[PDB]
Design a binder for this molecule. Structure first.
Ligand SMILES: COC(=O)[C@H](Cc1cccc(C(=N)N)c1)[C@@H](C)NC(=O)c1ccc(-c2cccc(CN)c2)cc1
Ligand SMILES: [Ca+2]
Lengths: 234, 51
């Protein structure tokens, strides 16, 4: 997260973190329920064996609410194609259930029609994670959150050097130095409606971070609701 | 209808038969006024934890 804000105590409880054997976080995720984590499909390539950590806000210490969870099954999207970044979604089933507590709670899955008509029509969205604080910097040590405006589909299709498929959407600023970044990938994009937060996207990609005229690209969750449901049932 | 003020629903809204119908996410129960959504447990989805 570039130019964001620190997630204060219990502000971003649906945030998960994929850590490699070296215990270093390399991608984000969203808690969907006690057993499932939503993440980016392209994150499954940056590690041979990873685990999920929840309840974390400061990789510097240990507050206690933290919990590491081993992965039982990883459900990567069948049509995900590395080259185009299309179908950038995957679901992880945890070996043991997550026990909700302070800083550890799920995000709500919305209904497609309502979400796209009411949620994605909202002015802002919220993205969070332990990714870089600058384009060429190191991973963040404190969990951060950023308010990112929904970007007009055409102006976003036009700003991008690459094809913006029907499974992606834009968010962020054109010039303002605020935007997700490396490490935040797989992380949660959420929309608040009457103090209730719904999963609306997955941190996917962008050309660099917070570059002028470039936006942040997110997987369009509302397009995979049916698939996520089936994934969480089997 | 659902386009006025989300139809006065807390969450999901559908315009079935020229009328508004509210519903909620998993872990919630539609209030008796058929609009509000009541959490069924201690850590309902989408809610920031302020124990
Ligand atoms: C330092 O820079 C970063 O971290 C970003 C990644 C990244 C990750 C998460 C969020 C954001 C963001 N800015 N919102 C950016 C860097 C590593 N990535 C890129 O430049 C980048 C990512 C994808 C494409 C790309 C997309 C579609 C088709 C193709 C044709 N094959 C290429 C091109 C460039
Ligand atoms: Ca910690």
């Amino acid at each position: 997260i570039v130019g964001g804000q620190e997630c204060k105590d219990g502000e971003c409880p649906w945030q998960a973190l994929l850590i490699n054997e070296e215990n270093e976080g390399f991608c984000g995720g969203t808690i969907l329920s006690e057993f499932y984590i939503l993440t980016a499909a392209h994150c499954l390539y940056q590690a041979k064996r990873f685990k999920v950590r929840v309840g974390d806000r400061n990789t510097e210490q240990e507050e206690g609410g933290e919990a590491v969870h081993e992965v039982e099954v990883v459900i990567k999207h069948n049509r995900f194609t590395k080259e185009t970044y299309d179908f950038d979604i995957a679901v992880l089933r945890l070996k043991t259930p997550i026990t909700f507590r302070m800083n550890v709670a799920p995000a709500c899955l919305p209904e497609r029609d309502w979400a796209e008509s009411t949620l994605m029509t909202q002015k802002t969205g919220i993205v969070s994670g332990f990714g870089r604080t600058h384009e060429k910097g190191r991973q963040s040590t404190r969990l951060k959150m950023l308010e990112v405006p929904y970007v007009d589909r055409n102006s976003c299709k036009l700003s991008s050097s690459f094809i913006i498929t029907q499974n992606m959407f834009c968010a962020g600023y054109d010039t303002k130095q605020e935007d997700a970044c490396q490490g935040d990938s797989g992380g949660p994009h959420v929309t608040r409606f009457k103090d209730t937060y719904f999963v609306t996207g997955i941190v996917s990609w962008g050309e660099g971070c917070a570059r002028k005229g470039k936006y942040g690209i997110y997987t369009k969750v509302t397009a995979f609701l049916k698939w996520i449901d089936r994934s969480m049932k089997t | 209808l659902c386009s006025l003020d989300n139809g006065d629903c807390d969450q999901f809204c559908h315009e079935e038969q020229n009328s508004v119908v509210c519903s909620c996410a998993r872990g919630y129960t539609l209030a008796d006024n058929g609009k509000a959504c009541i959490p069924t447990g201690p850590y309902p989805c989408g809610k920031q934890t302020l124990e």
